[PDB]
Amino acid sequence: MQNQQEENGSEISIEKMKRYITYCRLKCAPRLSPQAAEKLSSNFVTIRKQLLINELESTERSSIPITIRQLEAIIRITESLAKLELSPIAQERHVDEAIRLFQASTMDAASQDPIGGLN
């Protein structure tokens, strides 16, 4: 099945992936567009506002913290997505899926914390 999928083109070989990641890292280093900064700032302040009100109501510190390093993590994920299609600039669609992946990774882990939930 994997050989048939590679022949079709919906999967690519491991050595091809290796050399493609090498070319992508040596070739493209994208940037955030100025219109993509406002969305990142708005979502990074909304999540921390939710954590702030949850900590104020619970009066106990959350076990999994959300910091500025998480903002730069989202930036790095967005620029990786833009580096996937060799895009010199990152559009809104990379930001949106970087947010959705961050929700699926760190936000549900924080929701597993009862202090990080309560909403």
Ligand X SMILES: Nc1ncnc2c1ncn2[C@@H]1O[C@H](COP(=O)(O)OP(=O)(O)O)[C@@H](O)[C@H]1O
- Binding positions for ligand X, rule: CB under 6 A: 68-69, 72
Separation of alpha carbons 101 and 115, rounded Å: 22
Helix, strand and coil content of the chain, in percent to the nearest 5, comes to 70, 5, 25
**73 Cα distance to chain centroid:** 7
34 near another protein (CB under 8 A): yes
For another protein, give the closer residue by CB, 5 or 35.
35
Member of 12, 21, 45, 118 binding another protein (CB under 8 A):
45
* Residue (61 or 69) nearer to ligand X, CB: 69
Minimum Å distance from CB 63 to ligand X? 18
Q: Which residue has the tokens 């909403």?
A: 119
Contact 62, 44 (CB under 8 A): no
The footprint of another protein (CB under 8 A) covers 25-32, 34, 37, 40-41, 44-45, 48-49, 51-52, 55, 61, 65, 67-69, 71-72, 75, 86-89
